[PDB]
Amino acid sequence: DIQMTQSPSSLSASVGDRVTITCRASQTISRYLNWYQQKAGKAPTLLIYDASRLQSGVPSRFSGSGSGTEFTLTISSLQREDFATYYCQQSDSIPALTFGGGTRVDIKRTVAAPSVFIFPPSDEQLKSGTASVVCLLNNFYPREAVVQWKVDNALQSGNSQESVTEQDSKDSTYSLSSTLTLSKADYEKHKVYACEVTHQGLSSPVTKSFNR
């Protein structure tokens, strides 16, 4: 398949900013390159075809350029309705028609470190044999964040899952919840439970912990 490398994966913008997104194809595709917009909860819509031609109804602030392997989508002066995810797609070779990985355009605000909270498992849950330990990273920006779990200073890998909220409509932040799952039997064999958070708003990682 032709591989499409789309950059960046995440860009923050303010109303009025110019935005540039690039797409590079692994082999030449002439001008057979399209761009789509996908708003949260909606199907994609076609913005540009033939590298640079605007679909009817698309505002003039959108433009596309390039041929061969290197292509660009530019928004000249971003408006509120343009916060969305954008995708390139080559239409030179089938199968497979291939999409870039997407560019998520979110609302710019100042950096905000997370407030971090750790929650032990409840006694009620432990009665049925599993322990969930939860780490909350509240109201941070930007979205990139890393959580590392430690149990008696042993790094835990493979036994946690996390999810992240959508950007808050009022304060433009994100929040993240991570759950470490272990058996009650293992939980009761260890003392110190810790969540270590790395985030751009902190010049060193922050750890929250409890002793069982």
């Binding site: 239409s91 497979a96 969930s132 509240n138």
Partner: protein
């Protein structure tokens, strides 16, 4: 306006089959090549299949692994995707999309895929799972700002809803997307930040509703 409407999504067991439908309106369906494109939860767009207007050519992405069949009934303005050998990783929203077919401002003579896909349906959701319907267990996340919450664990299928104090508490609430556990059951958390000074005095109750299992739970969350 010109539109496409998908249907047929739902829950199917691994190894099973499912037929999706896509009905077009207000255009001459037989003139256009048609596509299926899918999007797994939180992931990007993946093209999966193509059929020409006259049905004489079909293509499939390698990820189909030659398990699916694309077809159409132009007399009923309908495109179909017959899926077989389904696996958990086929869980996604499935979109049907029409070829633009030309690079002119208005397309009268329709070619192939070279100029993108100009009309998309709203999508239909397919979930592939062997799990059985099950209501959640609700556990406390016990608490000058304090955080508290509820862990809504081991339920199937989606969705669950969570409110706090019967809807009276909305400020500072974050209800997170569920995660799919290796057991095949979902788990989610809902949290709220509140003044620490309110902890001895204000009651905090999370109201959980899992309609698929008719399970409702009200959990009062207090300092341990």
């Amino acid at each position: 306006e010109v539109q496409l409407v998908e249907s047929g999504g739902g829950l199917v067991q691994p190894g099973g089959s499912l037929r999706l439908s896509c009905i077009g309106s207000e255009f001459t369906f037989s003139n256009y090549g048609m596509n299926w494109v899918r999007q797994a939860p939180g992931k990007g767009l993946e093209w999966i299949s193509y059929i020409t207007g006259a049905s004489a050519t079909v293509y499939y992405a390698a990820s189909v692994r030659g398990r699916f069949t694309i077809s159409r009934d132009n007399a009923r303005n309908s495109l179909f995707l017959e899926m077989n050998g389904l696996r958990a990783e086929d869980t996604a929203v499935y979109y049907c999309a029409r070829d633009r077919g030309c690079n002119s401002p208005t397309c009268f003579v329709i070619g192939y895929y070279y100029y993108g896909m100009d009309v998309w349906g709203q999508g239909t959701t397919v979930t592939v799972s062997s799990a059985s319907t099950k209501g959640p267990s609700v556990f406390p996340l016990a608490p000058g700002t304090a955080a508290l919450g509820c862990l809504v664990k081991d339920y199937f299928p989606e969705p669950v809803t969570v409110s706090w104090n019967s809807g009276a508490l909305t400020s500072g609430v974050h209800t997170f997307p569920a995660v799919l556990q290796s057991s095949g059951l979902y788990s989610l958390s809902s949290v709220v930040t509140v003044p620490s000074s309110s902890l001895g005095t204000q009651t905090y109750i999370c109201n959980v509703n899992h309609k698929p299992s008719n399970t409702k739970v009200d959990k009062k969350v207090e300092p341990k």
